[PDB]
Design a protein around this ligand. Structure first.
Ligand SMILES: O=C(c1cc(Cc2n[nH]c(=O)c3ccccc23)ccc1F)N1CCN(C(=O)C2CC2)CC1
Length: 350
């Protein structure tokens, strides 16, 4: 039969459920899509991968950068097959190298969800796009370009583009209202400091993110791979999140998520600290302080959340003991402090 979805929702579904596009992104992360096919991805395989990354972290923390690290890394590479051709497999020793493999394990986890969704099939009663959309359990409502909502989020996106991210501009192609099943029932409405904040992710992750929500990293993952602990990270500057779309000149279409974030009492921090969650003791979120952020003067309100609009003003924060974050980032440690609201289809103009 024919599809009953809006044509804009149809395009969105085709975009995020493109398994072959997921194949391409993984091959660009030096992952072996043939020896270990994304159709044969198991939660247990990804689980063992996280555990291998933890053993690597143990070696780095212990200074054991010889045999032990070599064998630890080889265990990760055996559980998570890589395709380096004739290159020798590289040792994982810095935090950034650790984070890179966490991102890969995250994308594999969200591809596992997406492949399971697309593979669940009916026959000739519903259009395939309609069944994928139903299986999402997340309503996606196309908003009108001339509508008022398009106007406010466009200014949010353009006016919070950071000036140090000058290699690209962004054009808003389409706007969707998001209502994931159950998120509104779980949301901590009692908490104050509710803001509409950004979250960017690779194109492979959206099916998993929309269907399961933004989630807390598993216990077996190495804690040092998360600069402010195992939580859910947002920015008030659109481009800082948009960097995490990992769009390229050739794949210059990505998605940006806007979410209501029940920040409550922020535990404000200057530098990173993977153990930041233990330092909350009563407070509800971590705020990493940046030298630049939208000013309280331009803040507005949308559906009960503070939209930190306006051009970014100089904040005045400076870390004397070390690196100073260029822009804010907020971290909550429970998904019930997050309600997804808007999905932006964004063209990156490099
Ligand atoms: O939000 C994060 C996260 C993101 C990042 C990078 C990031 N990604 N995207 C952003 O918009 C952003 C904004 C400010 C600062 C960081 C970011 C780093 C550590 C993190 F724990 N998550 C970690 C991965 N997520 C998962 O659901 C996996 C399944 C456990 C989603 C929640």
């Amino acid at each position: 039969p024919e599809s009953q979805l809006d044509l804009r929702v149809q395009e969105l579904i085709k975009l995020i459920c493109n398994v072959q596009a997921m194949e391409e992104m993984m091959m660009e992360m030096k992952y072996n899509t043939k020896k270990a096919p994304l159709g044969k991805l198991t939660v247990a395989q990804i689980k063992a991968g996280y555990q291998s990354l933890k053993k690597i972290e143990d070696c780095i923390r212990a200074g054991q950068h010889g045999r032990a690290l070599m064998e630890a890394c080889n265990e990760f590479y055996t559980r998570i097959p890589h395709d380096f051709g004739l290159r020798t497999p590289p040792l994982i020793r810095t935090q950034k190298e650790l984070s890179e493999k966490i991102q890969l394990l995250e994308a594999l986890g969200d591809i596992e969800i997406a492949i399971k969704l697309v593979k669940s099939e009916r026959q000739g009663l519903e259009h395939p796009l309609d069944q994928h959309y139903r299986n999402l359990h997340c309503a996606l409502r196309p908003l009108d370009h001339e509508s008022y909502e398009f106007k406010v989020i466009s200014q949010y996106l353009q006016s919070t583009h950071a000036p140090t991210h000058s290699d690209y501009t962004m054009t808003l192609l389409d706007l969707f209202e998001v209502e994931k099943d159950g998120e509104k029932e779980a949301f901590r409405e009692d908490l104050h400091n509710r803001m509409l904040l950004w979250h960017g992710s690779r194109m492979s992750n959206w099916v998993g993110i929309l269907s399961h929500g933004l989630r807390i990293a598993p216990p077996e993952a190495p804690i040092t791979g998360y600069m402010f602990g195992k939580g859910i990270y947002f920015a008030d500057m659109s481009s800082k999140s948009a960097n995490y779309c990992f769009a390229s000149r050739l794949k210059n279409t990505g998605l940006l998520l806007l979410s209501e974030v029940a920040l409550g009492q922020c535990n404000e921090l200057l530098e990173a600290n993977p153990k930041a969650e233990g330092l909350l003791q009563g407070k509800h979120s971590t705020k990493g302080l940046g030298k630049m952020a939208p000013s309280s003067a331009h803040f507005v309100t949308l559906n009960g959340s503070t939209v930190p609009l306006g051009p970014a003003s100089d904040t005045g924060i400076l870390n004397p003991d070390g690196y100073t974050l260029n822009y804010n980032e907020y971290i909550v440690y429970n998904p019930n402090q997050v309600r997804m609201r808007y999905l932006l289809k964004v063209q990156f103009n490099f």
